[PDB]
Every structure is written in C-alpha cells, then in structure tokens.
Design a protein around this nucleic acid. Sequence first.
DNA 1: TCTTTCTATTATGGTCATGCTATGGTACATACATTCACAAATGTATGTAAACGTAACCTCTGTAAAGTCATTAACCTATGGCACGAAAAACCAA
Length: 79
Amino acid sequence: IETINKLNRISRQMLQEMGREPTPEELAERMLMPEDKIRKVLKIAKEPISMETPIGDDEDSHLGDFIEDTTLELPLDSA
DNA sequence: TCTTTCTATTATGGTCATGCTATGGTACATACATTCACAAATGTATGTAAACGTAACCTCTGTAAAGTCATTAACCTATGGCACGAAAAACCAA
C-alpha cells in the first residue's frame, strides 16, 4: 500500500508537470526500479467489481448472467 | 368508560432480451524469520546379456478294420418225356 501510494503521488506529480499520461519508463528511470516490478505493481492494484452492477435501465439486466462455471464439464466427455 | 387524527411496513408480472465497465488519495525507520530456488548425493530403478525345460513336432514302423474278390454250389432258364384236359367225330334214344 505504501509503494502504491508513492507511485500514485509520483504519477500525479508527473501528470501535473508534463501534462500527459504517466508512462512507467520515466518512473523506472527516476525511482531506479525495474520495469517488470512497476508492471506487476500496476497490475495487482485493482478494486473488484460487485455482484449486482445495474447495466440497463430496466430491472431485468443484472449479473448471474454472462459468467459461467468451468467446473461442470461436458456431458459428451462423460459419455 | 370509548371511536377518529395522526406515525410507519407490505404491495404489482415476466416473459421476448439489449450494450461498455471505473469512481479523488492519504509516512517512513529498524526488525527478525518464513519461504522459494538452486547445489549435490542416495536409493531403488529400468534395460542389456546368458542358462534350463518343454511349450513340443515331424518321421516311421506295427496293429487293426474296411472296401473287394478266389472258391462252390443254389436255383433256374433251357432240353426231353409222359399225363391231361379240351375239342371235335360218332352213335344212340325219343
């Protein structure tokens, strides 16, 4: 959490000074960190999505749809 | 001793189904050990030879049962010879 907050403050200061997106190559050149570590820290940090997420205007389109369970295998393979 | 005027939860359907997914940040300094990841050695492992025995297995001579053909004589068409029963001639009675 400390490293994520430090990289967020450095990215905010870099977007304030430069004026474009915080490309991680300049962060790796500044904080002397390897680039794959910066990719890993930027990839892990993400908040999960809730199980309802109202998409449409009507109360018919919610979750419990488009998500499948891969444990239940095919009946043809069992046959 | 008793009926109205207010303060809060339930309720009305789903079937035919839709697209594109995140939204603002807010400190570091010692610390000691659990865990991942490689060196190097054990141990049982697998795959290459070599010996015995019978899975046998064809080859050949002897015993045995089955088609056929030597006898020999039983019956059977022939031949000769003698009864036999039919067909015609004869003669008698009415």
